[PDB]
Design a protein around this ligand. Structure first.
Ligand SMILES: [Zn+2]
Ligand SMILES: [Zn+2]
Ligand SMILES: [Zn+2]
Ligand SMILES: [Zn+2]
Ligand SMILES: [Zn+2]
Lengths: 177, 84, 220, 51, 182, 174, 103, 53, 182, 215, 42
RNA sequence: ACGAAUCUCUUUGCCUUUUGGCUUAGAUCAAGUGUAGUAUCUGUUCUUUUCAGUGUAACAACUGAAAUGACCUAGGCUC
C-alpha cells in the first residue's frame, strides 16, 4: 500500500559559485605544467576545465557529492600540482587531489580536519576561506565570532598544523581578504 | 550535587560555542534575537535560498542581497535604512 | 497583568487559555504560541504535588501478555512464568547438565518474525496528539475499537441469545414496537425481516441487514 | 490480613491505603500504624452509611 | 548477536511476564545491549517489542522507566530513516510525560531517549511537543523544557529554522523575506 | 438530551454485551457503565449516550419495558427570584392570605414561607420580578393590616437589591 | 565520564594529534563508555598533546596509553564527536578515595 | 455573575463552571455555555467575549 | 554526614565551619586518610557559599598550599584543586592582598609555597591578570627576597601552562629580563 | 500536485520533496457519503476522532491528519513537478521535477518488493563505504593510506545529508547507486562481498536497468 | 567487635527460637546473615 | 397450652500424622569492599486572630509587630 520511490538527477544544476585556477593534473605530457586549468563548482558538483587552447574545454566531471560546498580555493605549496582546499557542511576542512586512477580522472582526499558540527551554522568556520598567497596557511572564518588558521606544509606528505584561533563573541563578518 | 554541577558547567560551554541556548529566564527579546539571527544565516547561506530571495526582491545583484541579510543581524540597521 | 477575558480575545481558540496563563512573564507571547497550529499542550500533571504514576490505578496493572503472533512459538507452555528443586539437586544439575530443556522449532521461530509476521503491527499505536496520562486505560480502548468493528446491527451473538432468552430464527422482542413506532432513524437503509424484508430471511443469528482505482505506484 | 497483596512485580502493597512495603517487616509497621487505622475507620463509616 | 535475535527474543519476552522486579529489569537491560550489538538489524523487530516498552513506560517504578528509554535510545538511532514513525510517535507519547522527573539516573536516561526520538521523528514534528513549555508560567515546567530545547538546538541549529512559531503579529522583528513569493 | 438511562441491570452484564443490544436501535457514541472500584461490581445501571436527541427519544420509546436480561425487565428512561422579608406580621394572616395580598403587585413564583422568630412571625415571599416586588415595598411598607404594622424590605443572602442583582434578574425574566 | 559525575572534560578546539587509551581502557568510547562499533578517531587539543601527559590515557589519566581512541557509531550519529577535546583533566573522587584508605 | 456567591475552595471554584447554576446565569444572560467561557466571574467581561463570539 | 554537611553548609555560617574545620589540619598526629577527608570537606564547602572574606582566604592558604609540595602526586593534585576553587570564590582582588606580604616573608619555606600557589591562581584566572603583581615583585627595589620569588612564580607558571605559555611570553620575559644582571 | 485522489506530491523552499496520503479512515468516509453530509452533521465519526477534537482544538480542526509517505532532501528548490503516465514508452509513470538552479530530476516508483530489496542493499553498501574502507585499513596496521571519508570525499554521512530537515522515508537515492559504476573492479568486489548470492555483474545489471527500461 | 542487634534481627530471633527451640542454635544462625550461633544464644 | 416431627443456631461431650526410632545435643561447617546517587514504610511535630515584606503558577512556607467590651434576631450603613 506504500509508495517506494527511486530518485535520479537527469541534469545537474548549473549555479557555479566557486572557481579556482592552477595546474591540477597532468594531461598528455611528460613534464609540462602551466596554470591554464580551471575548476568550477556548484554546491554539489565539481567540473574541471582547460583553457590552454584559447577556449573552455571540459576535461572531467566527477562523482556525485553529497554535501554542501561552502568555499573552494587553490592551494599551491612552496616547492607539486595545485590542490583544492574545500569546506562543506560536514564541518571539516578537506584538502583534495585530482589524480588519474585506472582509466579515469578522479578525486582523492588527502586531509580531513574536523571543525565543529555539521550543517550551515553561523558558528561553523566554513563561510570564509582565504589562502596565503605564498601557500603557507589556510584562514577559515565563520559568519559569527570564529576564525581559524592552519599552517600547511609539505615534507614527504601534506601536513597541517593544529589551528590558531580568534574568538570574537559578537562580530558578524561581512568580507575577508 | 555533582551531577547538577556538571550540567551547570556544561551549559556555559555550550552557550559560548553555540550562541542560542537559554534557560527559564530567557527574555522574549533574547529569544527572538536568536531566532532572527539564525534565520538570516540560512537565507544568506543556502544558495538556492539566496537566489529565491534576491529574485523576488528584484535586487540588482545577488551579492547586494547577501549584505542586506548580514547587515540585518544588527539592531541598528532599520534605523540606518530610514536615515537615507 | 492582563485579565483572563482580556487574554482570551487575542487568540482564535479561547478555550485553550486558562487562569494561570495570566501569571506568565509574557502572556501575549505564551498565548499565541499555544494557539499555533499543531502545538501540543504541556503534560497536565505539572500542577500536582504527588508523583507521576503514583496513584491507585497502578494497583490494578496486569502482567505482560505476549503478542498473539509470538504465542504461536509455544514458549508459554514450555516456560511457565506466572504462579521446585532443592539446593542439592541444583548442585547436581551443574555437573550433569540436562540438554534440550527448550524444544523450540527453529524454523518456526524465524518464520514468526520474517514470514508469518513481516507485516504485523500492534492494534493500538497512539497518534500524533495522543499524549499518555496517568489514569488512561489503553486496554479498554482497543477493546472498544474492536467492539465497534465486529459487532453490527442485524446480527445478535450466541452469548446475548442466552441472556435475552431469544434463540435463533426468532423476531427480537421490540419487533412490535417498531411496527407501532417505526423503523430506526439512525439507520435509513436497515431492512428487517417481517417489516420491510422477507420473513424467510429470518434465519439463524441474522434478522436484519443494512441494504444500501489503484494508487500511484502500487506494488504489483 | 485481608488487604495485603503482591503486585505484578512481586512487591507488597496495601490496597486500602495504596502503600508499598519493601519487606514483611515494613508491612507490620504499616498495619500497626495510624494511617492504616484511619483508612479502616473510613471503610467502616462508608459501609455503615450505605448498606 | 551470534545466534540470531529471532531465537532469543521470544524467550525473553515470555520471561518478562514473571512477577519479579529484578527479572523484568534484567529483561529490559538485556534488550538494551541486544540493540546496541545488532545495529541496523533492529528494524526487523521494532513492532514486536513496542507492546513491551509500553508496559515498562506506564509503570510506577523509575528503574522500569530508566531502562525502557535506554532501549528507545538504541532503537531510534539505528532505525531512523526506515519508515517506522508510527512506532516512535506512539513511543513519543508515552515518554513525553516523564519530562518532569528529578532523579539523576532516570532523567539523564529519559533525555537521551528524547534526543534519539527527534532523529526518528525529525526536529519539526518533535518540537510540537516542546513549544508550549518554553514560556510557561511555572518555573519547574520551564526548567525541564529548556533542557530539552538546548539538546535539540545543539543538534539542529540550522534545521530548526523552518519550524519556529513566529508570525508577524507574534514577532516585532519578524523577517519580511519569509513572506516573499517568487 | 443525548443520554438516556438504563436501569434494572443484572451485574453479570458487561460493557461488550450492552453495546450489542443498543446498536440494533441506533448507532451509539459512548457507554459509561459505573463500577464500585473496590468490589469491582457494577451497580445495576448504565448511562448510554447516542449521537443526537432524535435517536435518544426513539430508544426510550422502543426499549422501555421490552427486553429481559437474566429475566430482569430492562427499563429505559430519559434524563434566582425576588425575596421580600416581612417583619412584624399580624398573626391573623394566613399563607393563603399572603397570596391574596401580594398578587396585586406581582406574580408569585412560589408560595410564601411563614417562619417564627424570637413569637415574631416573619415570612419569605417569592416574586418573579425585581420590579414587581418594588411595588410591594413602595405601597405596603409601614402599612397597617389586620390592625398590626407590617414592614416590608429585602431578605438577606448582604441584602437583596444590588446593582448586579438588578441587571441579571432582568435577563432571567427575559 | 557517563558514570562519575565529577570528571571534567576539556572541550577545547581539537587539533591534529590523536588521543590514546591504555590497555585497561582499550576499546571504549570516551563519551558514552561503550565497547562496541568504533567509527572515527579522537583528536585532542594542542595543550593536551604536549609533554609527559600526552602519552597518558585520556579516560583514566594515569596509565600510559598504547592504542588509539575512537568515538562509537552512536556518538558520531549524534554529533558528539564534534563538541571538543574529550580528555578528562581531573582524577575524580572514586580514584582518590581508594588511594588514601589503602595507604 | 452568580449573585456574588463565595466558594470556599479552588477545586470547587473550578468545578463551579460546569454546574447547573453557572449554566443558568450564563444561558439566561444570552451566552450559550461551553469551555470558551470556563473562566471569568464578572458579568461584564463575558459580554465583550460573546459579542466577539 | 558528608551529604548532610554539604546541604546544611549554606544555612550554617562559613564562619562556623572554618573556625572548627581548619585547626585539625595542623596537628602532628594526623593520618593520611584523616587529612584527605577534611581537605575533601573544605572543597565541598567552598563550592556552595561563594562569598569568602579576606581573613578566611588566608587561613585556607596556610593549610592548602603545603599540599603542593607533597611526596605523592595524588596529594599535590588535591592541593591544586582547592586553590583553583578558592580562586573563583575569593576573586582576584582578595587573594593578591593576602599573597602580597607572604612573598616578602623572611622564611624560605613560606616563600616557596606562596610562589607555587600564586601560579595555580594564575592558571585559574589568567596570566594577563597576574602580570602586574608579578611585574612588581620582579622589580621591587625594596626587598631582595621579593625579587627571588617573583621569578619563581614565573617558573611555576611555565611548568603549569606548558605550550600555553607562548601567549604570555612577551609579558613573562619583560618581567624577568633585568634580573639576569642582578 | 495530485498523484492520485488520496496522495499529493510537493516541495517547499528549503529544498525538500515529499508525498502526503489521506489516511484510510478518511478515504472510507469520503467514499460512502455525500459531500453535503460533512457540512450537515450527519456523519458518525468514531469516538476517538470526536475526543481528539475536543482535546486538541488548534491541532485537529479537520478531524484527520495526512500520512507522510515519502521525504527527501534534494538540495534545490523545486519550482515545477510534471506527472507523466510513461516516459519513452516505459511501463512506469514517472514524475519529473525542475529546480530553480537548473536541476532536472525524477522520482520513479519501484513496483516489485524484490526490486526494492535489491536496490536498498546497493544503496546501503555505497553509504557505509567510508566506514568499510577505513576500518579495513586500520585492521591491517594492527596485524599485517586511507583518510576518513575517502569514498565520500568531504566526510559527510549520506543519510544525514538526505535527512537534513526530516528523515528520509522510502526513497532510494539512485545518484549514490551510480557512483558504484565509477569504482574500479577491485573496489567493486570489496563492497559486494558482504551481500550474499549477489555478484558484481548482477549489481551493474540492476543499476543500468533503470535508465534503459524504467524511463 | 560490633555486636549491634537491629530490631528486625530481634524479631528474627524470637520467631527463629519459636521454631528451632533453645538447643539448635546453628539452625538459628542459618537464618541470620550477620550473627553466629554463640551470638544468638547470648 | 401440650403429645410431636423436620430445617437453622449456641452450649456440653467426641476428635483429627497433638514428632517414624537409636548414639559421641551422632559429627562438623557458614556474612567482601569503596565512590556517586534514587525509591519505600513508621514514629514524631503543625498551640493562632489580622497586616506588612519576602515567596509561589497559585498556594504554601519563612521574617516582623499588635484587639477587647456592650446588644438584637448565620446576619449589623451597630457603637
Ligand atoms: Zn493500609
Ligand atoms: Zn584538550
Ligand atoms: Zn585508561
Ligand atoms: Zn559513544
Ligand atoms: Zn458563576
Amino acid at each position: 500500500d506504500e509508495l517506494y520511490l527511486y530518485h535520479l538527477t537527469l541534469k545537474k544544476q548549473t549555479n557555479f559559485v566557486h572557481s579556482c585556477i592552477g595546474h591540477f593534473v597532468d594531461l598528455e605530457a611528460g613534464s609540462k605544467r602551466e596554470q591554464s586549468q580551471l575548476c568550477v563548482a556548484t554546491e554539489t558538483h565539481l567540473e574541471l576545465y582547460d583553457t590552454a587552447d584559447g577556449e573552455l574545454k571540459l576535461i572531467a566531471k566527477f562523482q556525485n557529492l553529497f554535501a554542501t560546498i561552502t568555499s573552494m580555493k587553490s592551494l599551491d605549496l612552496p616547492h607539486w600540482p595545485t590542490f583544492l582546499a574545500l569546506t562543506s557542511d560536514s564541518g571539516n576542512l578537506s584538502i583534495v587531489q585530482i589524480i588519474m586512477h585506472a582509466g579515469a580522472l578522479r578525486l582523492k582526499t588527502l586531509v580531513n580536519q574536523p571543525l565543529t558540527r555539521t550543517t550551515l551554522r553561523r558558528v561553523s568556520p566554513i563561510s570564509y576561506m582565504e589562502i596565503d598567497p605564498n601557500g603557507r596557511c589556510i584562514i577559515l572564518s565563520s559568519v559569527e565570532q570564529n576564525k581559524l588558521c592552519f599552517l600547511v606544509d609539505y615534507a614527504q606528505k601534506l601536513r597541517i598544523s593544529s589551528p590558531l584561533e580568534i574568538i570574537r563573541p559578537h562580530m558578524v563578518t561581512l568580507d575577508m581578504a | 550535587m555533582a551531577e547538577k554541577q556538571r550540567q551547570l558547567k556544561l551549559q556555559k560551554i555550550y552557550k559560548q560555542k553555540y550562541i542560542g541556548l537559554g534557560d527559564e529566564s530567557t527574555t522574549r527579546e533574547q529569544w527572538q534575537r536568536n531566532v532572527r539571527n539564525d534565520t538570516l544565516n540560512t537565507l544568506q547561506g543556502h544558495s538556492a535560498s539566496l537566489e529565491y530571495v534576491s529574485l523576488s526582491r528584484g535586487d540588482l545583484s545577488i551579492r547586494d542581497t547577501r549584505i542586506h541579510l548580514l547587515k540585518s543581524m544588527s539592531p541598528g540597521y532599520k534605523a540606518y535604512l530610514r536615515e537615507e | 497583568k492582563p485579565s483572563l477575558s482580556q487574554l482570551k480575545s487575542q487568540v482564535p481558540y479561547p478555550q485553550i487559555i486558562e487562569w494561570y496563563d495570566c501569571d506568565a512573564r509574557y502572556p501575549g507571547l505564551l498565548a499565541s504560541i499555544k494557539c499555533t497550529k499543531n502545538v501540543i499542550p504541556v503534560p497536565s500533571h505539572w500542577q500536582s504535588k504527588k508523583e507521576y504514576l503514583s496513584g491507585r490505578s497502578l494497583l490494578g496493572k496486569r502482567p505482560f501478555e505476549l503478542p498473539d503472533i509470538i504465542k504461536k512459538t509455544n514458549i508459554e507452555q514450555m516456560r511457565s512464568t506466572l504462579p521446585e528443586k532443592s539446593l542439592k539437586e541444583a548442585s547436581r544439575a551443574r555437573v550433569q547438565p540436562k540438554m534440550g530443556a527448550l524444544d523450540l522449532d527453529y524454523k518456526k521461530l524465524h518464520d514468526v518474525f520474517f514470514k508469518i509476521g513481516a507485516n504485523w503491527k500492534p492494534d493500538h499505536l497512539l497518534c500524533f496528539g495522543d499524549v499518555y496520562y496517568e489514569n488512561r486505560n489503553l486496554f479498554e480502548e482497543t477493546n472498544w475499537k474492536r467492539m465497534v468493528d465486529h459487532k453490527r446491527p442485524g446480527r445478535i451473538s450466541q452469548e446475548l441469545r442466552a441472556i435475552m432468552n431469544l434463540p435463533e430464527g426468532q423476531l427480537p422482542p421490540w419487533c412490535m414496537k417498531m411496527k407501532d413506532i417505526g423503523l430506526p432513524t439512525g439507520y435509513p437503509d436497515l431492512k428487517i425481516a417481517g417489516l420491510n424484508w422477507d420473513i424467510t430471511n429470518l434465519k439463524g443469528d441474522v434478522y436484519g441487514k443494512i441494504i444500501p482505482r489503484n494508487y500511484f505506484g502500487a506494488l504489483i | 490480613n485481608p488487604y495485603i497483596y503482591k503486585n505484578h512485580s512481586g512487591k507488597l502493597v496495601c490496597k486500602l491505603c495504596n502503600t508499598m512495603h519493601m519487606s514483611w517487616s515494613s508491612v507490620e509497621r504499616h498495619l500497626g500504624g495510624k494511617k492504616h487505622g484511619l483508612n479502616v475507620l473510613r471503610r467502616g463509616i462508608s459501609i455503615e452509611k450505605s448498606s | 548477536k551470534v545466534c540470531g535475535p529471532y531465537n532469543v527474543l521470544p524467550v525473553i519476552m515470555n520471561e518478562y511476564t514473571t512477577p519479579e522486579t529484578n527479572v523484568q529489569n534484567g529483561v529490559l537491560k538485556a534488550m538494551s545491549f541486544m540493540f546496541e550489538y545488532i545495529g541496523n538489524m533492529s528494524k526487523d523487530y521494532i513492532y514486536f517489542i513496542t507492546p513491551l516498552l509500553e508496559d515498562a513506560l506506564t509503570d510506577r517504578d523509575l528503574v522500569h522507566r530508566q531502562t525502557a528509554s535506554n532501549v528507545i535510545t538504541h532503537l531510534a538511532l539505528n532505525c531512523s530513516g526506515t519508515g517506522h514513525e508510527d512506532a516512535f510517535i506512539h513511543l513519543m507519547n508515552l515518554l513525553i510525560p516523564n519530562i518532569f522527573e528529578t532523579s539523576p539516573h532516570a532523567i539523564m536516561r529519559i533525555l537521551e531517549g528524547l534526543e534519539a526520538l527527534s532523529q526518528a521523528l525529525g526536529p519539526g514534528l518533535f518540537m510540537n511537543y516542546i513549544w508550549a513549555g518554553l514560556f510557561h508560567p511555572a518555573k519547574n515546567v520551564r526548567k525541564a523544557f529548556w533542557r530539552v530545547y538546548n539538546n535539540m538546538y545543539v543538534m539542529y541549529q540550522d534545521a530548526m529554522v523552518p519550524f519556529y512559531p513566529v508570525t508577524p503579529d507574534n514577532n516585532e522583528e519578524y523577517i519580511e523575506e519569509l513572506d516573499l513569493v517568487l | 438530551g443525548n443520554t438516556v438511562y438504563v436501569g434494572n441491570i443484572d451485574p453479570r452484564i458487561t460493557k461488550e454485551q450492552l453495546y450489542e443490544l443498543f446498536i440494533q436501535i441506533n448507532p451509539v457514541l459512548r457507554i459509561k457503565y459505573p463500577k464500585d472500584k473496590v468490589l469491582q461490581a457494577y451497580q445495576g445501571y448504565a448511562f448510554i449516550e447516542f449521537y443526537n436527541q432524535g435517536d435518544a427519544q426513539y430508544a426510550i420509546k422502543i426499549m422501555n419495558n421490552t427486553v429481559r436480561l437474566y429475566d430482569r425487565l430492562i427499563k429505559v428512561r430519559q434524563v434566582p427570584i425576588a425575596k421580600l422579608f416581612i417583619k412584624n406580621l399580624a398573626d391573623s394572616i394566613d399563607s393563603d392570605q399572603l397570596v391574596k395580598i401580594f398578587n396585586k403587585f406581582g406574580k408569585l413564583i412560589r408560595e410564601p414561607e411563614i417562619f417564627y422568630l424570637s413569637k415574631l412571625k416573619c415570612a419569605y415571599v417569592y416574586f418573579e420580578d425585581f420590579e414587581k416586588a418594588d411595588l410591594a415595598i413602595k405601597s405596603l411598607n409601614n402599612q397597617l393590616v389586620a390592625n398590626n404594622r407590617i414592614t416590608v424590605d429585602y431578605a438577606f443572602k448582604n441584602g437583596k437589591g444590588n446593582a448586579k442583582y438588578g441587571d441579571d434578574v432582568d435577563r432571567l425574566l427575559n | 565520564s557517563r558514570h562519575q559525575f565529577d570528571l571534567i572534560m576539556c572541550l577545547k578546539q581539537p587539533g591534529v594529534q590523536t588521543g590514546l587509551l591504555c590497555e585497561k581502557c582499550d576499546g571504549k568510547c570516551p563519551i558514552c563508555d561503550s565497547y562496541v562499533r568504533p567509527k572515527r578517531k579522537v583528536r585532542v587539543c594542542e595543550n593536551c598533546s604536549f609533554g609527559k601527559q600526552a602519552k597518558n590515557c585520556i579516560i583514566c589519566n594515569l596509565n600510559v596509553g598504547v592504542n588509539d581512541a575512537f568515538y562509537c557509531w552512536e556518538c558520531c550519529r549524534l554529533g558528539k564527536d564534534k563538541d571538543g577535546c574529550p580528555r578528562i583533566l581531573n582524577l575524580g573522587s572514586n580514584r582518590l578515595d581508594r588511594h588514601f584508605e589503602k595507604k | 455573575i452568580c449573585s456574588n456567591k463565595v466558594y470556599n475552595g479552588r477545586r470547587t471554584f473550578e468545578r463551579h463552571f460546569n454546574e447547573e447554576r453557572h449554566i443558568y446565569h450564563l444561558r439566561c444572560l444570552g451566552i450559550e455555555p461551553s469551555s470558551v467561557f470556563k473562566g471569568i466571574t464578572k458579568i461584564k467581561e463575558a459580554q465583550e467575549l460573546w459579542k466577539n463570539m | 554526614s558528608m551529604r548532610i554537611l554539604t546541604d546544611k553548609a549554606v544555612t550554617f555560617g562559613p564562619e562556623m565551619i572554618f573556625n572548627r574545620l581548619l585547626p585539625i589540619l595542623l596537628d602532628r598526629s594526623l593520618e593520611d586518610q584523616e587529612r584527605h577527608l577534611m581537605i575533601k570537606t573544605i572543597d565541598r564547602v567552598l563550592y556552595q557559599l561563594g562569598d569568602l572574606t579576606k581573613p578566611y582566604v588566608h587561613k585556607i592558604l596556610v593549610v592548602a598550599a603545603p599540599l603542593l609540595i607533597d611526596e605523592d602526586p595524588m596529594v599535590r593534585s588535591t592541593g591544586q584543586e582547592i586553590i583553583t576553587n578558592l580562586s573563583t570564590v575569593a576573586g582576584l582582588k582578595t587573594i593578591l592582598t593576602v599573597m602580597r606580604p607572604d612573598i616578602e616573608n623572611e622564611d624560605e619555606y613560606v616563600r616557596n609555597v606562596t610562589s607555587r600557589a600564586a601560579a595555580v591562581v594564575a592558571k585559574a584566572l589568567g596570566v594577563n591578570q597576574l602580570l602586574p603583581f608579578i611585574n612588581a615583585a620582579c622589580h621591587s627595589r625594596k626587598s631582595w627576597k621579593a625579587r627571588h620569588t617573583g621569578i619563581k612564580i614565573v617558573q611555576q607558571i611555565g611548568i603549569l601552562l606548558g605550550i600555553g605559555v607562548l601567549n604570555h611570553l612577551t609579558g613573562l620575559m619583560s618581567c624577568i629580563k633585568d634580573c639576569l644582571m642582578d | 500536485k495530485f498523484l492520485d485522489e488520496a496522495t499529493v506530491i510537493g516541495a517547499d523552499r528549503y529544498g525538500n520533496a515529499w508525498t502526503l496520503r489521506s489516511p484510510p479512515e478518511c478515504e472510507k468516509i469520503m467514499s460512502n457519503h455525500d459531500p453535503s453530509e460533512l457540512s450537515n452533521g450527519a456523519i458518525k465519526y468514531p469516538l476517538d476522532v470526536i475526543t481528539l477534537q475536543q482535546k486538541l482544538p488548534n491541532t485537529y480542526d479537520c478531524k484527520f491528519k495526512f500520512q507522510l509517505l515519502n521525504h527527501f532532501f534534494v538540495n534545490d528548490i523545486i519550482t515545477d513537478f510534471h506527472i507523466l503516465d510513461s516516459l519513452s514508452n516505459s511501463d512506469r509513470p514517472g514524475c519529473i521535477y525542475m529546480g530553480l538552479q537548473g536541476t532536472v530530476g525524477c522520482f520513479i516508483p519501484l513496483l516489485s518488493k524484490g526490486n526494492v530489496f535489491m536496490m536498498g542493499n546497493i544503496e546501503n553498501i555505497m553509504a557505509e563505504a567510508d566506514d568499510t574502507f577505513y576500518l579495513d585499513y586500520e585492521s591491517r596496521k594492527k596485524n599485517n593510506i586511507i583518510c576518513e571519508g575517502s569514498c565520500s570525499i568531504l566526510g559527510r554521512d549520506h543519510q544525514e545529508y538526505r535527512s537534513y530537515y526530516a528523515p528520509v522515508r522510502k526513497v532510494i537515492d539512485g545518484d549514490l547507486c551510480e557512483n558504484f559504476l565509477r569504482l574500479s573492479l577491485n573496489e567493486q568486489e570489496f563492497l559486494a562481498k558482504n551481500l550474499k548470492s549477489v555478484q558484481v555483474e548482477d549489481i551493474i545489471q540492476t543499476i543500468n536497468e533503470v535508465r534503459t527500461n524504467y524511463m | 567487635k560490633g555486636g549491634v542487634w537491629t530490631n528486625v534481627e530481634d524479631q528474627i530471633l524470637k520467631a527463629a527460637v519459636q521454631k528451632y527451640g533453645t538447643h539448635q542454635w546453628s539452625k538459628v544462625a542459618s537464618l541470620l546473615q550477620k550473627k553466629t550461633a554463640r551470638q544468638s544464644e547470648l
